[PDB]
Amino acid sequence: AVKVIVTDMDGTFLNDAKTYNQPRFMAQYQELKKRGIKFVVASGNQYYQLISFFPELKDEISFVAENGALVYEHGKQLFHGELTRHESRIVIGELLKDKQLNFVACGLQSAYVSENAPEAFVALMAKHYHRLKPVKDYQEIDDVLFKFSLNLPDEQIPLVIDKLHVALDGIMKPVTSGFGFIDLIIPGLHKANGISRLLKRWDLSPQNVVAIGDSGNDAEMLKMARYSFAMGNAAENIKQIARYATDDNNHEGALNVIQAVLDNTYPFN
Ligand SMILES: [Mg+2]
């Protein structure tokens, strides 16, 4: 029985150019709604950036933003994570020890970046955080913080992750959201956790869930879902975790999974 379809955005639902087939998806969505199947967007991007992709459906569908740190259901904020003042001060201090590491502080009202960060970095992060405010001091932000995002040479991700895993003693866990992206999240607050909040809400089970993804921060989501799909362009460990597969993001791979649910083809026959 399928009752929920959850999809990642970057490298998944979106093609390399960050667009999707809107008319095709809109028709699929209307049939899903008709069958009473819920649609969920699960991404590490900011809530405000995520809804920019679904302006005409933003209050109907549900969102697991910031990797599960911010969850909306039918247009209403359901939950948000939070780092204590001390925790965030410690994480920021550790990040700052590396004057070569560029990062953004993700909060409930907005994301923040040093007013001294490189222009290319800010322009790049602006594509993932539509609410991004320059700040003089990361330590003086009046908002609830619940995640940090770094951009760095992709080939350096394993070192940094290992290093950060120890230097923060688990206060926050380093995870990869795709090429050149590293997210620091509150332990346990991943996409799978956010999705479960919705399932609990709807009295549904992981057995009724279809999930589609392509990178490290999708691991728990795919392991939890009965119908797990790895995009054709997915990372190796993700292809291994996922039970099923589909075309890559430049060939409507996510929409094809939705189509299989609607037409009952493998694995939904
Ligand atoms: Mg992705």
The domains of the chain are located at 1-81+189-269, 82-188
Which technique?
X-ray
CA of 216 relative to ligand 1 center, distance in Å: 8
This structure's resolution (Å) is 1.9
The DSSP letter of residue 201 is: H
Count of CB atoms situated within 10 Å of the CB of 4:
23
| b/e map 143-181, b = 16+ CB within 10 Å | ebbbbbbbbbeeeebeebbeebeebbeebbbbbbbbeeb
* Residue given tokens 């150019």 in the structure block: 17
Whole-number Å distance, alpha carbon 14 to ligand 1 midpoint, is: 9
The CATH homologous superfamily to which domain 1-81+189-269 belongs is HAD superfamily/HAD-like (3.40.50.1000)
Residue 224 assigned ligand-binding role? no
- Helix, strand, or coil here: 130? coil
Question: Is 44 labeled as ligand-binding?
Answer: yes
Q: Is 183 a catalytic residue?
A: no
Angle at 231 (CA atoms; ends 230, 232), nearest 5 degrees: 115
- The sign of the dihedral angle between the CA atoms of 116, 117, 123, 126 is negative
* 8 marked as binding residue: yes
Q: Where are the alpha helices (DSSP H) in the chain?
A: 22-35, 47-50, 85-96, 119-126, 157-167, 191-202, 219-224, 236-241, 253-263
Token look-up 């909306």 returns 72
* The pairing of beta strand 181-185 with beta strand 145-151: antiparallel
CB 11 within 8 A of CB 178: yes
Q: How many whole angstroms from 87 Cα to the centroid of ligand 1?
A: 27
The residue type found at 15 is N
193 labeled part of a ligand binding site: no
Smallest CA-to-CA distance from 47 within 17, 80, 7, 23 is with 80
* Greatest alpha-carbon span in the chain: 57
9 is in an annotated binding site: yes
* Angstrom distance (rounded) from CA 107 to CA 111: 5
What separation in Å is there between the alpha carbon of 233 and the centre of ligand 1?
A: 10
Domain 82-188 adopts which CATH fold? 3.30.1240
**Tokens 């959201």 found at:** 177
Using the mean position of ligand 1's atoms as its centre, give its distance from the Cα of residue 86 in Å. 31
DSSP 25: H
> For residue 228, what are the contacts with CB-CB under 8 A and spacing of at least 6?
211, 222, 241, 242, 243, 244
Does this chain's domain 1-81+189-269 share its CATH topology with 82-188?
Answer: no
Query: Residues near 63 by Cβ (< 8 Å), separated by ≥ 6?
Result: 40, 41, 42, 47, 50, 51, 70, 71, 72
